[PDB]
Amino acid sequence: YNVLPTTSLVLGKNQTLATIKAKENQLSQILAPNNYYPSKNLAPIALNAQDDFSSTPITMNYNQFLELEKTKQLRLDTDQVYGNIATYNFENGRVRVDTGSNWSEVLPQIQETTARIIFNGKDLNLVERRIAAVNPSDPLETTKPDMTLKEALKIAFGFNEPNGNLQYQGKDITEFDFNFDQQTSQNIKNQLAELNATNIYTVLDKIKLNAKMNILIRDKRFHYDRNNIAVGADESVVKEAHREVINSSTEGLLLNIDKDIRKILSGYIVEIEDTEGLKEVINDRYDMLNISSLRQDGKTFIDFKKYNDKLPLYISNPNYKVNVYAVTKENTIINPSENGDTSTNGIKKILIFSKKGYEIG
Amino acid sequence: YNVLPTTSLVLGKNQTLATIKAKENQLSQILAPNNYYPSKNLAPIALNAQDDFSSTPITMNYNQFLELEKTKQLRLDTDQVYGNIATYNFENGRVRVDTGSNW
Amino acid sequence: TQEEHLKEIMKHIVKIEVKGEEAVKKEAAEKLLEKVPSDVLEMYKAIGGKIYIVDGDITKHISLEALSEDKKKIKDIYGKDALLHEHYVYAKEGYEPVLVIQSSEDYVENTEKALNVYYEIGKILSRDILSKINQPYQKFLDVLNTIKNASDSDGQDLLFTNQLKEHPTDFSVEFLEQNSNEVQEVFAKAFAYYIEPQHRDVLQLYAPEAFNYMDKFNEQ
Amino acid sequence: TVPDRDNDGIPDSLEVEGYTVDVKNKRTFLSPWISNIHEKKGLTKYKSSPEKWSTASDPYSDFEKVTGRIDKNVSPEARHPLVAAYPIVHVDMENIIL
Amino acid sequence: TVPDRDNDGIPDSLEVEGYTVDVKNKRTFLSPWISNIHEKKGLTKYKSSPEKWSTASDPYSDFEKVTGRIDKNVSPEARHPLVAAYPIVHVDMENIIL
Amino acid sequence: TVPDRDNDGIPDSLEVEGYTVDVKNKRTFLSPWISNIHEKKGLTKY
Ligand SMILES: [Ca+2]
Ligand SMILES: [Ca+2]
Ligand SMILES: [Ca+2]
Ligand SMILES: [Ca+2]
Ligand SMILES: [Ca+2]
């Protein structure tokens, strides 16, 4: 409550233009979790002031102005956030804001006493949970009940053992991989050395957790970048999600593509193969890949017409092959090559769709 | 907690340009030990004001401007740092800031 | 302060030792009888009275078998119909009077439940303890008149049935003879409201005279 | 007088040995854990610190978190005492105007 | 009534002669020092002033520092009462803009 | 002493089982719900 972030306008590598605390025009009274201020239908708010009474605009000199209009690199950092707690009153039930206390008092207390677990199996989104675990060198911290890893995963992420096997939704835990920083990985190494076990997946009910641990749990299917975003799968997985064709037309394709899967695909490639074999690509540019639209019925819709000058495909002979290929984010390009290459030539395409011309319409 | 350093812009040997107390744009709520404000991945903060309501830029005259563009010697001193203690409460366990007391 | 409120709400909320279902059921019934003055309880066992706290349907009992299915159609203290096998108290008119109740948690919760049990006890007094030496009986006969002819029909909408209200004439000093049934149901009603602590002021309210009598009656 | 060193309205042996909250008619009752009854109802066994008013050190007691006398914007998976409840706020920038 | 002149919740003879803090089940107990038991557990013998509420004069009591009822951002080596706990802040300058 | 855990000046069994507010002469009285009287007056069970 009473959210006032402290942010920073930065040019270049680390050339900070300005550091601005949010003023009373920029106050957010409520920021409930999984929400935006302002709401997503409304337009974002405007920050343009430096004074405490908001009477001075944010100033830029000449050289920074030239560098900004050349490089267009203007980044924004979130340094710290002011905000209060409202507490319950046993008197009348009314939850009231203490303006004195803030989360600044509380967040390092939470960080130094808990284990942190980040998990992205719910729609490839990094979900962070901190769970209280024992620091042995702190006598007050040892007064907590012990936390195994499996119990923590059960209570924190809604996991279950419906058949004695730990599961997130209908997926097994064994399809997820574990990642640890060096201290936590060392401690897990020591605990597995003491338990004389090799597979961690067998001993999840015995893993004693401690304070300040860090546990990253990802899907084994997808490939991840530096920032641990899902970037791309193997070919076996991408094909498996496209085995459901709904509408075949020369205007587009309607498929029931899995919501998780589609989020790692940048775009699509549409070509036509001869009966002897040619490679004539309709959308033959690096920036002609975005055709995949998502209808509100839960079915992803492909469209040939968007990059064919408002016209459907051209079937010169109904015995050809109409190929539609997809591009992962790890394989996509965002600029032409060295010399001039604005084509789909050097792209790691994946076979999703290959049907004849008399089987479409 | 509530870190407000008092710093000083100095030219030359000991030619002090200005002495500035950190204002509310420059407040640091938490500075835990072995840490930076802001964090090392983020860019450092900008100090450019003299007023208590941050409405006057930090001014330099002509001769100091010439000497700065000749010598490029502009040093920064940390004179004193304002900041508070948060103490434990035996009532509810909550560690609370006394704004009255300081280090 | 906030902790004092916390101590209030927890003393209400937190329990530690479990009496168990059978003990709680019995204890709850006992607590009801503690509101009843032992003045009438001793007079009940004096005339050969037994108190039972059974479970399930009351009709399924040893001391009460299938006696006369007509009386298994009952009205509550509100006068709304009820099937006895779904109820939780019944008093027996016979040469060996005996009262039997169901056992429930709700006898420390449902004041409505308690109110009908004090109602049936009110019957027990009004006939099985009062019908003997009722006469001259004028002591209660006069206060019942005041409820009839007065402003605010509330008191007679509280205690009288749908018959004594609509009887146009004032109450004759023969009606108690012909209808010792109806005049003792009223006494059973006003008893239960008086005994039940929360409906007590309600009796002082809507029927001040019936309270004024039943207040005097017990304590002296 | 039963002890509660953490002063959070809930005694120490219950926080150690396991407990639960159960409504009976319209009233919340703080029972200690019994596996014959509460396990059949699906009630979750709770353990917390006998000396921490807030075992997760968040600004909410153990008792408020198990009772429900809390800010309801707290997520339901954060209603367990060993689960911390805290905001994570970061700002995105949609547009520049120079 | 045992004396504690320093009023820090811990008596004077224990601060003089040595003491320790030990959990037993889930509860911290302030024992005086016994070498037969606490030395085998690896517990550190503690001595502090009987007349200083904070023997290191930092704004934290002796009892808070040995108990753990403290700001947890205090370094663990500063959790000893004879070790002071204080910030050291200095500002660096990365860049000029004229 | 009748309990009111919610401390709102009205006891707990009445809030559970039904109640009403009724004036008699010029004075508001917090009655528990009785269907013989308050229903005929048109009072709303709470
Ligand atoms: Ca407790
Ligand atoms: Ca506790
Ligand atoms: Ca002492
Ligand atoms: Ca001392
Ligand atoms: Ca109430």
Side-chain angles (χ1 to χ4, degrees), chain C residues 21 37 62 71 121 130 146 152 156 181 200:
Chain C
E21 184 174 1
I62 298 169
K71 76 183 184 186
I121 297 166
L130 189 273
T146 305
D152 295 331
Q156 72 183 358
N181 195 2
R200 178 177 290 176

mmCIF file of all heavy atoms in Angstrom, chain C residues 21 37 62 71 121 130 146 152 156 181 200:
data_model
loop_
_atom_site.group_PDB
_atom_site.id
_atom_site.type_symbol
_atom_site.label_atom_id
_atom_site.label_comp_id
_atom_site.label_asym_id
_atom_site.label_seq_id
_atom_site.Cartn_x
_atom_site.Cartn_y
_atom_site.Cartn_z
ATOM 1 N N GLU C 21 -17.942 -37.204 21.446
ATOM 2 C CA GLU C 21 -19.318 -36.938 21.023
ATOM 3 C C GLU C 21 -20.318 -37.319 22.106
ATOM 4 O O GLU C 21 -21.089 -36.468 22.550
ATOM 5 C CB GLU C 21 -19.628 -37.676 19.714
ATOM 6 C CG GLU C 21 -21.025 -37.376 19.153
ATOM 7 C CD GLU C 21 -21.291 -37.988 17.784
ATOM 8 O OE1 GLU C 21 -20.397 -38.672 17.242
ATOM 9 O OE2 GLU C 21 -22.406 -37.772 17.256
ATOM 10 N N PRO C 37 -35.153 -24.354 37.434
ATOM 11 C CA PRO C 37 -35.035 -24.453 38.892
ATOM 12 C C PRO C 37 -35.419 -25.847 39.364
ATOM 13 O O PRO C 37 -36.409 -26.424 38.908
ATOM 14 C CB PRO C 37 -36.012 -23.389 39.404
ATOM 15 C CG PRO C 37 -37.003 -23.228 38.297
ATOM 16 C CD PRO C 37 -36.232 -23.439 37.027
ATOM 17 N N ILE C 62 -37.518 -47.419 24.162
ATOM 18 C CA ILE C 62 -38.018 -48.502 25.000
ATOM 19 C C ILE C 62 -39.125 -48.006 25.920
ATOM 20 O O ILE C 62 -40.213 -48.592 25.970
ATOM 21 C CB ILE C 62 -36.857 -49.125 25.796
ATOM 22 C CG1 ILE C 62 -35.831 -49.722 24.830
ATOM 23 C CG2 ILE C 62 -37.383 -50.159 26.797
ATOM 24 C CD1 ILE C 62 -34.543 -50.123 25.474
ATOM 25 N N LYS C 71 -50.827 -38.476 18.179
ATOM 26 C CA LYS C 71 -49.996 -37.557 18.949
ATOM 27 C C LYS C 71 -48.567 -37.459 18.426
ATOM 28 O O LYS C 71 -47.787 -36.670 18.971
ATOM 29 C CB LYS C 71 -49.963 -37.953 20.422
ATOM 30 C CG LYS C 71 -49.092 -39.134 20.743
ATOM 31 C CD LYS C 71 -49.209 -39.455 22.213
ATOM 32 C CE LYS C 71 -48.285 -40.583 22.607
ATOM 33 N NZ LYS C 71 -48.500 -40.991 24.020
ATOM 34 N N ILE C 121 -41.525 -28.911 29.242
ATOM 35 C CA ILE C 121 -41.455 -28.844 30.703
ATOM 36 C C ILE C 121 -42.582 -27.977 31.257
ATOM 37 O O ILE C 121 -43.149 -28.266 32.321
ATOM 38 C CB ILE C 121 -40.068 -28.324 31.132
ATOM 39 C CG1 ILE C 121 -38.981 -29.295 30.679
ATOM 40 C CG2 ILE C 121 -39.950 -28.147 32.648
ATOM 41 C CD1 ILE C 121 -37.578 -28.724 30.760
ATOM 42 N N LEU C 130 -49.671 -29.339 38.067
ATOM 43 C CA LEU C 130 -50.611 -28.278 38.435
ATOM 44 C C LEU C 130 -52.072 -28.689 38.384
ATOM 45 O O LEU C 130 -52.868 -28.129 39.140
ATOM 46 C CB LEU C 130 -50.392 -27.026 37.564
ATOM 47 C CG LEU C 130 -51.050 -25.655 37.776
ATOM 48 C CD1 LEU C 130 -52.425 -25.521 37.096
ATOM 49 C CD2 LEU C 130 -51.129 -25.331 39.272
ATOM 50 N N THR C 146 -56.339 -10.191 31.134
ATOM 51 C CA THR C 146 -55.709 -8.923 30.762
ATOM 52 C C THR C 146 -55.035 -8.985 29.397
ATOM 53 O O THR C 146 -55.076 -8.013 28.635
ATOM 54 C CB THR C 146 -54.691 -8.540 31.846
ATOM 55 O OG1 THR C 146 -55.346 -8.504 33.118
ATOM 56 C CG2 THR C 146 -54.079 -7.168 31.590
ATOM 57 N N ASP C 152 -52.588 -3.701 21.862
ATOM 58 C CA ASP C 152 -51.435 -4.511 21.453
ATOM 59 C C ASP C 152 -51.684 -6.010 21.547
ATOM 60 O O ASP C 152 -51.314 -6.649 22.538
ATOM 61 C CB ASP C 152 -50.158 -4.164 22.227
ATOM 62 C CG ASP C 152 -49.673 -2.778 21.945
ATOM 63 O OD1 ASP C 152 -49.921 -2.282 20.831
ATOM 64 O OD2 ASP C 152 -49.032 -2.185 22.833
ATOM 65 N N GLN C 156 -51.111 -11.691 22.984
ATOM 66 C CA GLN C 156 -51.957 -12.817 22.634
ATOM 67 C C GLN C 156 -51.574 -13.422 21.291
ATOM 68 O O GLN C 156 -51.947 -14.567 21.013
ATOM 69 C CB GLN C 156 -53.437 -12.409 22.668
ATOM 70 C CG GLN C 156 -53.918 -11.513 21.566
ATOM 71 C CD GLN C 156 -55.355 -11.118 21.748
ATOM 72 O OE1 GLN C 156 -56.012 -11.551 22.691
ATOM 73 N NE2 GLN C 156 -55.862 -10.291 20.834
ATOM 74 N N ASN C 181 -56.908 -27.978 28.763
ATOM 75 C CA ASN C 181 -55.896 -28.135 27.730
ATOM 76 C C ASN C 181 -55.327 -26.795 27.272
ATOM 77 O O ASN C 181 -54.113 -26.592 27.320
ATOM 78 C CB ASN C 181 -56.517 -28.870 26.539
ATOM 79 C CG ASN C 181 -55.488 -29.396 25.558
ATOM 80 O OD1 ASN C 181 -54.281 -29.262 25.754
ATOM 81 N ND2 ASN C 181 -55.973 -30.005 24.482
ATOM 82 N N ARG C 200 -36.387 -14.077 27.630
ATOM 83 C CA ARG C 200 -37.007 -13.620 28.864
ATOM 84 C C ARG C 200 -37.519 -12.195 28.739
ATOM 85 O O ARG C 200 -38.678 -11.909 29.054
ATOM 86 C CB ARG C 200 -36.020 -13.739 30.013
ATOM 87 C CG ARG C 200 -36.604 -13.223 31.284
ATOM 88 C CD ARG C 200 -35.679 -13.397 32.444
ATOM 89 N NE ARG C 200 -35.537 -14.799 32.807
ATOM 90 C CZ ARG C 200 -34.713 -15.230 33.751
ATOM 91 N NH1 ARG C 200 -33.976 -14.361 34.431
ATOM 92 N NH2 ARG C 200 -34.635 -16.523 34.023
#
